[PDB]
Structure of GCN5-related N-acetyltransferase:
Amino acid sequence: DLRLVDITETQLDDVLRVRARSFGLLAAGAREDWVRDAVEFVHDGRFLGVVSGDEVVAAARIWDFQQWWGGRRVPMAGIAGVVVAPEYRGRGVGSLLMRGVLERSRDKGMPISALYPATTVIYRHLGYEFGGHRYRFSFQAADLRSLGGREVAVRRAGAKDAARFLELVGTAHEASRASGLLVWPESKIAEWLEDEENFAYLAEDGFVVYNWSDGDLQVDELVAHSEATARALWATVGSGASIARTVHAYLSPNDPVHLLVEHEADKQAHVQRWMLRLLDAPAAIAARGFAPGAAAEVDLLIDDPGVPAQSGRWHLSVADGTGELTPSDRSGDVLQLGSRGLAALYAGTPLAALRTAGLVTGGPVASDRLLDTAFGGAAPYMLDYF
Amino acid sequence: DLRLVDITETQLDDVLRVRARSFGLLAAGAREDWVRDAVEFVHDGRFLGVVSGDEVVAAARIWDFQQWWGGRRVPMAGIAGVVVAPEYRGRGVGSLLMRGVLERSRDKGMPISALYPATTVIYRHLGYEFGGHRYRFSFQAADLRSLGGREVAVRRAGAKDAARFLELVGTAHEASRASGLLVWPESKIAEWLEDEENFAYLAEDGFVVYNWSDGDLQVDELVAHSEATARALWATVGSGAARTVHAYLSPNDPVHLLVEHEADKQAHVQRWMLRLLDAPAAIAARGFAPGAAAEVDLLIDDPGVPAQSGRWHLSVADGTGELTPSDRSGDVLQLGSRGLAALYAGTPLAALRTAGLVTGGPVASDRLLDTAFGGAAPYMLDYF
Amino acid sequence: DLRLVDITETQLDDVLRVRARSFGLLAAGAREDWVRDAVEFVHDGRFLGVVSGDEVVAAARIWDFQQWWGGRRVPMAGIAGVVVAPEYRGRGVGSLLMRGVLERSRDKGMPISALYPATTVIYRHLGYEFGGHRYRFSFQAADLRSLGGREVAVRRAGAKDAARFLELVGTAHEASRASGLLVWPESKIAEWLEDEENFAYLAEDGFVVYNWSDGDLQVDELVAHSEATARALWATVGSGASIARTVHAYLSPNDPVHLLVEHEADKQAHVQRWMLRLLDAPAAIAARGFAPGAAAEVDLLIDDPGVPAQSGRWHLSVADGTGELTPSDRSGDVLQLGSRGLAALYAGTPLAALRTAGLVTGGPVASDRLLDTAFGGAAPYMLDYF
Amino acid sequence: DLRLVDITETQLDDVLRVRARSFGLLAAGAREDWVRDAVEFVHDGRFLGVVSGDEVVAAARIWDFQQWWGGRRVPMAGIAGVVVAPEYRGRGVGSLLMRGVLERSRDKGMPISALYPATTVIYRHLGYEFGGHRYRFSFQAADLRSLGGREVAVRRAGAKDAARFLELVGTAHEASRASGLLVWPESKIAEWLEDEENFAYLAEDGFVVYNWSDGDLQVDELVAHSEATARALWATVGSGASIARTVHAYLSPNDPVHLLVEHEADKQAHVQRWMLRLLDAPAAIAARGFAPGAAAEVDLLIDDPGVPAQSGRWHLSVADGTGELTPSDRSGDVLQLGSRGLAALYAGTPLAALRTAGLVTGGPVASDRLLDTAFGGAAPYMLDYF
Amino acid sequence: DLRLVDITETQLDDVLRVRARSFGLLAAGAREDWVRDAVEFVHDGRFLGVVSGDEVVAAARIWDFQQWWGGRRVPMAGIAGVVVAPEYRGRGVGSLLMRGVLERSRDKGMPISALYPATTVIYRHLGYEFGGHRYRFSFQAADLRSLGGREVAVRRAGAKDAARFLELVGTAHEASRASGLLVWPESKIAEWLEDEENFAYLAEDGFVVYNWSDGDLQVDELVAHSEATARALWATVGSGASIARTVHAYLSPNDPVHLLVEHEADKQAHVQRWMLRLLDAPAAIAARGFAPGAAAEVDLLIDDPGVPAQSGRWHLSVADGTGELTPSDRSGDVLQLGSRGLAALYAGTPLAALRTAGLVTGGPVASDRLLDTAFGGAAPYMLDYF
Ligand SMILES: [Cl-]
């Protein structure tokens, strides 16, 4: 029968052997790198599995990310590589694994969690719901070329510039109160900057990173504070583009390029969705940034069989960009939500769509205006996939 | 030797000839129809053109629209079918025509205007800027069928049900303080439901209209106030034997929280532009974020429409806004027509600054402006 | 059993019947149009068919064209709509038909003939060989929109401007010593010009005609002497180009648009070939323009079973831009060639290619060069399909 | 601030670093091959660069080619691998580089230069203009298989046959009076025949080389004197094609295969263009072969600020297949050209097109006709890309 | 001069070079597996070739399969890897090789031969004809998942199970009187399951093997005796199908999935054909199973210049599932067959089709009912391609 387990650096082959049944083998190249990058998860309590008898039959790992929510950085458990063997169909193997993944994360002090679901039913059942997007837009390289900004000094960047990149990014997001985006460890970011096939460029108030990994020029991140720098960095890109007509870029759907280029992005675009769950509701609220003008005094009834600790009646108290979540004895027409409703609300989804989706019931409409302006802001997005 | 003009009914054939230079001829069917509603624009003085001597060399028409903004209805000139004859390249014809269009829209009391731009340059120079999106998502019909809802009563609907649809929509959008959506004249909703190519269904608290498209199904509009009704109408669209269902909707629509399979990663994302014609009127009509408050000065520089140029005070409180003349002095937010239209449409000041659409002013009070103008990103359902 | 016949008015529904079995039925207005055109061919002895008993079983028509050679207009028979009932496969109907066609063409005085072959085998046996090209190139609409020539007066053209179109092009081709191009009757030009699907524009020293029939913008023809008019006419096309990235165009590869435009035409091009036959070789030599400065006195041995009238040893005298092909009494080594080699040579194919292809034998290789320069010049092409 | 430099053996990794940022990383196999082929350029003063401090920021190499023009071999400088670091956009680095390359090419006594232009604008400013084409045609494999010549002997060929290939080609191009085709050093030819993935076959009066490197069969070059040998070599290719419908082929636009094959080549073809420049016009003229029978005596006013040594008024004297350009003290109206006009004229672009595209002005039109005669012949082409 | 040989191990590199001219180079990883698998063919005398003096010029190899016909196993020579150098075109090297192949097969005790034909012409001339099919059908992954049978025990399988797989399939095919299917040797089957790229599962009365080698999920073989097992196995396929919408399967058109699954297979399916040849008619007949309760006594006249040994009049006797072919000296109108007709009949093609195709002629059309019934049953098919 079924046993939760900590994957050893040994049994990585077993994990790959399971994974293969659903995805086929890796190239011997991509395989050597998969294994090299797994060891860190293994020796930091961040690679879990399910064993049946003496046989690894399921596995999942946990990134220790941080994530911007309203301009603050909240520790989050990014779940990836969930695999279950096909001959263990419908024996609730995935649920045991995921129940272990969840408490491992709660134990390590991650008040929230996120993933890209391969299917949605299994994750909705454990209390996840959609929280944001990843957008990919396509541009014409010639357009990026004629943006100008030739006076701006742009140089090539390497791993010695990681401190500088974090600084620029953390300044930008804190200003705009961004939500959804990943914070990568300064360590992990230097590696990215050392990658022979990663091209990174630094101006005084911005940077750009792009790659050629698929026959196509792709921009992974652009950050720029002034118009000048923005035009220089995009022109550096359009200039690296050789003769290719088009260039892809991961960016917010509010990004200033759209306001700068002469041809609109191509109508064909990529829209992905990622999911969110709260693991420690008070803590998540504590770390969150709230819209600076927000007053809100609201009670809410929480039903979370999966994390009973945060189940019950609570009062939300927010003002001055900060929030607190505390138990409550009150007795009124309160708001009722489950883990999904609770995660979706944290993610700034409008209460109208949540009532229509049945993810929340009850309470007065006065409260709906409040939480909409409190949890409101720019729509959550990220640039990464995992 | 060029002059702005009101298109008459007999000049329509000439407009179609100009149109053919850029688009090719209309099929016999689609021509007959084009002329049908062209007549209406002519009659309501919403069909402008440019003549050189005694022959048409450009035209454009003005939809008598209304557009949602913060859960309130605002009169807006939707500009469509802009065409210029090719031999008049480089003589500024398009620009002369559009200034004709701005003035007529202004004179008919529409404080804002919107359009889908074929090219960005001419329209940005007339003061328009991107203001929202139209999104198309693609679902598998099987996934909508699984939604269920079959316990909810749903009957076939038609033209006679137009009034009731309008109640249902208005309730939905007021409740969600929606932004960006068209309100069409009830004659066009009339001919919409009348069309046998369109399939309408109605429940106690929702409706849906859809049709065939290249062998797939397309949802024009779905409104549902409750979960069971949404399940019921999506599952209706998805009933059958038609694998793919396309839908026009916001990225925050509740479908995405119900359907067990995510919409296709490949999506269509188009943009439409906006311009203010009478800023104070536009402000007065707009709905503002509940519990938002702002009291700041603005410097508007708009050579295209000088009446809204100069310094203004903006007052927002209790969901209502007001724009009044200011003679004060000192550092302030400066906006051209483009920055102003994008701000009205909820675009965050950071972007406007990085794009050079806005400069100056204490960057700390950007916060109050973002908040007052914020809310659900503006989108719409239709193309025009 | 089968016999050659002149197609009559009341036999046109039958031709259409045969047509539909190979190509499918026409639309209903296409028929009304197809019929009206045909009637002209019937009343001028230019629509031949083959009947079996009382049934029409094949048919073909003869355009009364002219074609440019070395800057001169040469009368020519353009063969169109060769159609055969599928039931009458392998019975020689095609050959019988074509020989009738060839005969009707000499009888009407056309020294040369041309067509677009659906298959090559039958035509090669009857004496046609490839003689020229039709090129379609693809440009960016944006490149055209910015060529300039802003002051050049350019107006809508229509059926009244037909003679002026033929006038501009006449001086253009006489100048360049052009070869290959079609000379349509003024009547046909006028119809082309007045067609509401076609969009013509006129200036003091040029014109352009284009259309949107594909769904793509297609340039049928552009002519312009001076630089400014060339830039202006292309700029007109660029403005009719809507949001279409791409515009196609039928033109020479010597066309100056390649030297004017900023981005090279697309690599993906359309190259079609048309075939040629001499029917009265002394007459075709007399009518041809010959390269300026070019001179040669050589003998030729022609073997043409298909048209015995032009078999035998001739002598061609060439100087001052004219030629003449007289019966020759000489004897010795002499370049011999058949109908195919005779036509390709007239078309200015290199003798080296003709020898290797085996369409020419014997003769001193010394006087090969003499022939090359006589028939040399800009390579033959046309803009039309038929 | 930047400096023109000769790339040294130590700087070769630097060059690949620049190359990577606009073509993508080189796979370990291809990189060693890049290095082996780069040392020759380095140690013969044919690898230029631009340096900023001690960073390489741009590079280009010069092939020691000869190019056919009118039957004779003219030494030429082929420019390849032009690369400029993305951050150095809008700073004239490309021009700093190319001027060095032009200067170096002139010192080494190559009177002409050619390249394939990624973009037209910068090279046109440096005085290059389109001179010829590369064509690729598509054929049905079955049509080739049956061309015959069953008795012709054909064997595998290899490096040791290099000299024999060069002999056979040289014979052909001399008789045909060819223009545009490359002459490779025998070393490079032997390297080409040596490659295990190029398939080469030798006959008594011809050869063919083809390959499978793209999922399609592609003919690089086929040379054949007689009809039987042309048929044999094409049928050899046809047996190579296996079950594939189509075979692609780089050929002259006048290649005999079009007269031989049963189904016409596909309509869809590839048409690319290369550019040319004169570096030393009197030498370039003296090396050129000229049209047989052609005579000309005509003055010529050249304006080339980019190479002042060839500016001023010259006399073109053309007779007996030989030309000479001498300084002329005459006065009066005369054809004027800058570098682009001069190169395109030398390539035999018709005067008409030159005038319409504004590259040539002035002059009696008497000059035009004799000049079109003087530079005419088969249209310039080549089989190779570089 | 052309000579047939047995390929030795030291000639395998020469074989690959011949293969290369027709299929392009083998990826270095694919090349070593090829040489690996080639040696077993060499050491068992089942790799033939043709040499020209010293050089290898063509090759082919022979699988020692068995093939089901009417529920009995018949030894059969499966031909694969036919290659001829492209320069030896038109010299009949293919025929000389194949005649070699046939003779070796006949020597090794194999009464029949099968192959997938690249072209039909050469194999028909040698006596082969289409005898069966291989079908691929496409199903919704979700429909496979919801088939149920989760109570049924299903484990992962390895080479250990090889004996058992042969056992399960053996009894299934004897039951159904199967024709067309392959019998791999047990060793080839253990190596099959050992392959880390194949995923195999085993139940008490059935198994399934699938893989991901093309980017898609593909079922190589499924077998299942009970309904619950058929259900569980398809469910295992469904589970391992990841997020992929559709799965492909190789099976009979009469397979039981079509009766179980709720959405019909896609209209779009793959249908390949394989050919058959009799090498020794009395042996092949004696090994074949015949239809239950069919009887026949009838004379046949075989005309096989390829294999003279089997020409002449024969008597066919069929009773109680067994048939025997004896020589006859009777006279009188009888059914006449060449090698192709003889194969098609054996394969179960109906006599009416053989008559319209002209593969068969003569004889009382009445007795055709006997023959059709005797050779009849479920249509021959195969899961494997070789
Ligand atoms: Cl093989």
